[PDB]
């Protein structure tokens, strides 16, 4: 019966492939051949943030595009005032092995996690004057790779045990569990409307999940190796993914197939992070070779380079108002570019 | 100029001072990564000295602070989080000598660890434990069961030397690494001193690197 089931699955997959190909009327490049190229953009570093000892792994922008939070493997989670370069808070972590951080939309909480397999929530606006641990979520069975807030009371977490979770903060229980992946889940991104989310999980595939219903809706299997980053397109109808094979790809939820791939012959290093601009025309990708690249999401050509760091760029982020882009690195410095 | 941003600057400078003060203390402790086969003497080494994610443990010796991280609990592709321990000063290793079925997997994992891109210099440490159990077992059953190519005499010293060679020969780039070796015992606590000598040699090499000689 196992052979029969595998044959049925293969036939269904062939049917899916045929249906997807039937829709491939034209390529995005051919349609976009007429638009004017963005030319060349040369951004510059305006601020440098100093104070971390070890390599910095993650960072997140505030919803006001003024404050930001950075997490370093030396056991420190710092909050920076970007405009003036001051430091507001310096939370010491219980576990030094932090692999992610997040900033709540309202600015009242900050979440972190790592190899401890626990997601910790910190309250910033207490009456006592010191940041305290508000809640600890301890249901996973693997390292936490990413986490994002939906509101002040719900959080989505991705772990290396091949499953994702939706948690109710106040009660401290797993409200929902998402399963179906084969490898470890690395990256996570929430839709602008906040009803769906995607993830790529070290099996060369990305999945679309419904937050309220708790089932997998679509699967995309274009890449060749482990996907490390993911980010929604501003309108919420497409998303870009970077993998260890040194190439990026753009997928569309409604067409259900790969649209375009960004690669070059001189790049043989993987991508660690990706991000879009406010208008979505520029795709910024951090690479393993100590510099970040700025691609045209429509023309598939390299528009710019950022080469301020001296080690592996691990985290990249754009502000909500699109004024500046912040990049961290293993050299323990954060550069804000504009 | 600064209406009340002067107080914010004062607070930021105090935060900087505290961060630097803590960093000056964090750079004075030596980190060790503890690996080994499941159910092996991984915690046996820790238990012998006066010592689910990570099981970080700490102790002190000769005015030197030691951290040891047991990452065997993690069940995932090591390729994605193994780079976190690039700055450690040792890769302390354990292998059972009894069991006999845990051996092949052990060789594969040891070979993977040695030839890892990150641990191209970090001095590996090797601990053979369960020595009495192996001494009795080889006498009870020949060691050739899992060693078809075995041709030496069925004697404890011969077999021990054979397996030691079979373990140290996985290392390929012998110029950089400084793999040690030591036969652990059920009693007579010495292992801490053996890890002390290794770390004191690593410290000398680090000091030479800092100076510039090499």
């Amino acid at each position, epitope marked *: 019966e196992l052979d029969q089931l595998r044959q049925e699955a293969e036939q269904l997959k062939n049917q899916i492939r045929d249906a997807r190909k039937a829709c491939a009327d034209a390529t995005l490049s051919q349609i976009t051949n007429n638009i004017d190229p963005v030319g060349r953009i040369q951004m510059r570093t305006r601020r440098t943030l100093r104070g971390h000892l070890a390599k910095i792994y993650a960072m997140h922008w505030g919803t006001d595009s003024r404050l930001l939070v950075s997490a370093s493997q030396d056991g420190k989670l710092i909050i920076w005032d970007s405009y003036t370069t001051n430091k507001v808070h310096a939370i010491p972590l219980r576990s030094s092995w932090v692999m992610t951080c997040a900033y709540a939309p309202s600015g009242n909480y900050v979440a972190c996690g790592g190899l401890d397999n626990i997601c910790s929530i910190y309250n910033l606006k207490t009456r006592e004057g010191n940041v305290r641990v508000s809640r600890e979520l301890a249901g996973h069975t693997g390292y936490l790779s990413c986490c994002r807030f939906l509101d002040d009371n719900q959080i989505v977490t991705s772990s290396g045990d091949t499953t994702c979770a939706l948690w109710d903060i106040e009660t401290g229980q797993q409200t929902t569990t998402f399963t179906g992946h084969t490898g470890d889940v690395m990256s996570l991104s929430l839709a602008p409307d906040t009803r769906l989310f995607v993830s790529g999980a070290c099996d060369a595939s990305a999945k679309l999940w419904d937050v309220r219903e708790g089932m997998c809706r679509q699967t995309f299997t274009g890449h060749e190796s482990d996907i490390n980053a993911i980010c929604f397109f501003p309108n919420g109808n497409a998303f870009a993914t970077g993998s260890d094979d040194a190439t990026c790809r753009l997928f569309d939820l409604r067409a259900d197939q790969e649209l375009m791939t960004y690669s070059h012959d001189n790049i043989i290093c993987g991508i660690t992070s990706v991000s879009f601009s406010k208008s979505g025309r520029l795709l910024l990708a951090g690479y393993d070779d100590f510099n970040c690249n700025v691609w045209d999401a429509l023309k598939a050509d390299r528009a710019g380079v950022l080469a301020g760091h001296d080690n592996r760029v691990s985290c990249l982020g754009v502000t909500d108002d699109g004024m500046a882009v912040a990049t961290g690195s293993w050299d323990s410095f954060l550069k804000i570019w504009n | 100029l600064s209406a*009340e941003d002067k*107080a*914010a600057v004062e607070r930021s400078k105090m935060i900087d001072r505290n961060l630097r003060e803590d960093g000056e203390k964090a750079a004075r402790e030596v980190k060790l990564l503890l690996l080994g086969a499941d159910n092996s003497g991984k915690s046996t080494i820790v238990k012998q000295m006066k010592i689910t994610g990570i099981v970080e443990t700490h102790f002190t010796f000769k005015d030197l602070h030691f951290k040891m991280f047991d990452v065997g609990g993690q069940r995932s592709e090591r390729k994605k989080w193994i780079h976190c321990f690039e700055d450690v000063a040792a890769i302390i290793f354990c292998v059972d000598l009894s069991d006999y079925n845990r051996m092949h997997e052990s060789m594969k994992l040891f070979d993977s660890i040695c030839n890892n891109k990150w641990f191209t210099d970090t001095s590996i440490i090797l601990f053979l434990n369960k020595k009495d159990l192996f001494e009795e077992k080889i006498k009870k059953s020949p060691l050739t069961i899992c060693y078809q190519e075995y041709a030496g005499s069925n004697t404890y010293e011969e077999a021990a030397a054979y397996i030691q060679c079979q373990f140290e020969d996985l290392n390929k780039r012998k110029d950089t690494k400084e793999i040690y070796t030591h036969f652990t015992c059920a009693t007579d606590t010495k292992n801490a001193q053996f890890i002390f000598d290794a770390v004191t040699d690593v410290i000398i090499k680090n000091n030479l690197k800092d100076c510039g000689l090499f």
Partner: single-chain antibody
Amino acid sequence: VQLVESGGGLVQPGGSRKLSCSASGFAFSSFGMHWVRQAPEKGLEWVAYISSGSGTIYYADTVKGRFTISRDDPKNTLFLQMTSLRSEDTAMYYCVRSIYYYGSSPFDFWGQGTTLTVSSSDIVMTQATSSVPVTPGESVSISCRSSKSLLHSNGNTYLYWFLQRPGQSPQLLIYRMSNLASGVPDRFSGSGSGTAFTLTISRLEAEDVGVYYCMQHLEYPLTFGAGTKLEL
């Protein structure tokens, strides 16, 4: 969270005295401290300030030279040493806390007060409307004035509001002229451009009768106003 002060009493002119303010329930080491004065029937008047870490000990002109302010962090205490006391130093003294960082709300918590009696280029704030009859359920509006514009280049506006109820210590309502404090109802509001400000209360109810004070925090000699009083 609480602060209690002690050390007051009766002192002959030309003597010396020492007050004490003990804090509990919060992180003392992370807060700067302030001393404030209140004459028997006049408004408030800033006295002395000390910052976290003891790096800024600004004083007031009326007492600069014969006063001293110092703090003990491990013991969680604040001190004030006064020498050569005069007849003009008879008043009630309040201990206040303030924390300064982006988005903070300084002057949030005040003490209880301690009474002291002696036997026998600054910004000017005006509160000309010293009396206002009010009736429950009707809206009321208070006004304030300044000498020079309080707006700063960085978009801030340092004007504060405080309420003193009958026989009670003051409390914070609105910081920086637009932001509501923590715990106050949502019917309080405040607005106004540089050199003129106005507080607004909608659906006035009991527990709002008292004296309303203004305050500036743009420069060193912090200055209060005469105060406006509401009566039934």
